[PDB]
Every structure is written in structure tokens, then in C-alpha cells.
Amino acid sequence: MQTAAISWGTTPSIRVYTANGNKITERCYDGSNWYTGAFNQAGDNVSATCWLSGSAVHIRVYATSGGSTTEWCWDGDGWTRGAYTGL
Amino acid sequence: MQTAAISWGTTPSIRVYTANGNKITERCYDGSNWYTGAFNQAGDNVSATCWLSGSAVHIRVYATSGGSTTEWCWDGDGWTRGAYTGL
Amino acid sequence: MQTAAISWGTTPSIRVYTANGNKITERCYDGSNWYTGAFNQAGDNVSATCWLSGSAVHIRVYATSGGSTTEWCWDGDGWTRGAYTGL
Ligand SMILES: C[C@@H]1O[C@@H](O)[C@@H](O)[C@H](O)[C@@H]1O
Secondary structure (H helix, E strand, O other), X not given: OXXXXXXXXXXXXXXXXXXXXXXXXXXXXXXXXXXXXXXXXXXXXXXXXEXXXXXXXXXXEEEEEOOEEXXXXXXXXXXXXXXXXXX | OEEEEEEEOOOOEEEEEEEEOOEEEEXXXXXXXXXXXXXXXXXXXXXXXXXXXXXXXXXXXXXXXXXXXXXXXXXXXXXXXXXXXXX | OEEEEEEEOOOOXXXXXXXXXXXXXXXXXXXXXXXXXXEEEEOOEEEEEEEEEOOEEEEEEEEEEOOEEEEEEEOOOOEEEOOOOOO
């Protein structure tokens, strides 16, 4: 099992992405109890990074399934496929 | 063997966590030489995130051993278990 | 295959390091297209972190091959081997 961890803002919020059994899932902290996030994509490996637009977060998750990495983007309303490509 | 890397401030301070077998250890830089960190917990995989509130550093390390992830927290006065649970 | 992701700024800039087949390579975004970076070193595992000194980015990439981790540094004028050791 493999994880990635990010955080932002004043609280801060934290997100932890976990890859296990070719599934990546997301656990979330926003100042209170941890909960399960909306992120669900395939992969055996995961990295993530984020930045702020004021108080709004932008997240990029790099989900590797085998020999291919797909970027997934959170920009405030849902996860979308990003433009990232590898070599 | 696997690592996670974090940094903060302008110097900067850097921490590098290494999972080797089922042990995670920590190497530190605060502007002079690399030194040995106090973090020692179990895991075959590690991720980490950090932030400064003013001058106060806060670190969260996600230590995964098999299918279980434990959060360890540094907030200026020792490492303690965080509330994180996985799926 | 395994990745590490960093970002900085508000645009943002993003770098994704991919360890694939005992090599680590880099893909880059600074606001328009993804392009291939100059980073290329051995490794089966990778982590990275970065900071800004004024407007100048500094990156550290921790490349692990087997039981050895090597630090690679970007400070505005090529990648250089860093002083990091695990012990
Ligand atoms: C920042 C967002 O926070 C919650 O809405 C999660 O359900 C999303 O997946 C994302 O992490």
C-alpha cells in the first residue's frame, strides 16, 4: 500500500490518497473527524500536490497504473482528467 | 526502500523520511549539516506534509505498514499519534 | 512505476518526477504545455520538495536505488549532487 499527503490553508485541510489493490481512495480532514473523499481512480502508485487561489484549493493527483500515469484535477467542483502526459 | 520529503521556510528546513523494510527513520537539515531526526516508527511506506503557523512548524507523517496507515504528528513538542484512520 | 509531484506559485508551476525502469525523468508545466525537463538520474524510487527564494525556485529530488538515496539539487543553474546521506 502507498500513500500521498497534501495540506492547505488556514486549518489546514489535509488529504491523504491511498493506493491499494489497484484502487486509489481519499481520506479527508477539514478540522474535525476524518471522512472519505470523492476521489476514486485506478492505480498502484500515487503522488499529489496542491496550491491556493485565495482560500480555494487546486489539487493534482498523479495516478500510476502500470506503465501509465494519469493526472486528476480538483478545481472546486469535481474531479477532471488533466492534460499531463509522460515520456 | 522509499522516501518522502518535506520542507518549510526560507532557509529552508528539510526533512526526509525513509521507509526501509518496516522501519521509517528521519534525516533533517536546518541550514548546517544533515542530522538524525527523532522520528522512528514502523512502516514500509511513508508520506508527509507540513506547514508553518508563524514560526511554529507542524508536520504530519503517514506511516503505512501493510494495509494500515498511522498518522504521526509533530507540533513542536514530540511526535504523537493523530486521529487519522483509513478505510 | 512511481512518481513524485511538486508545485509552486499561483499559476502554478508543476514538476512530476517518474521513476520507471531504474530511471527518473521529469515532466514540467509552467502554465501552457507539458514539456520534458533536464532532470535525469538513476532510481527506482523518488521524492521531491521545493521552495522559493524570492522568485527563484529551488528543488531537491531524493532518488533511491536499492538501499542508497542520492540528493539532486536545482538552484537555477543545472542539477547538482547534494550533501544528503542517510547516515
Ligand atoms: C477538496 C475536496 O474536498 C472534498 O470535497 C473531497 O470529497 C474532494 O474529493 C476533494 O478532496
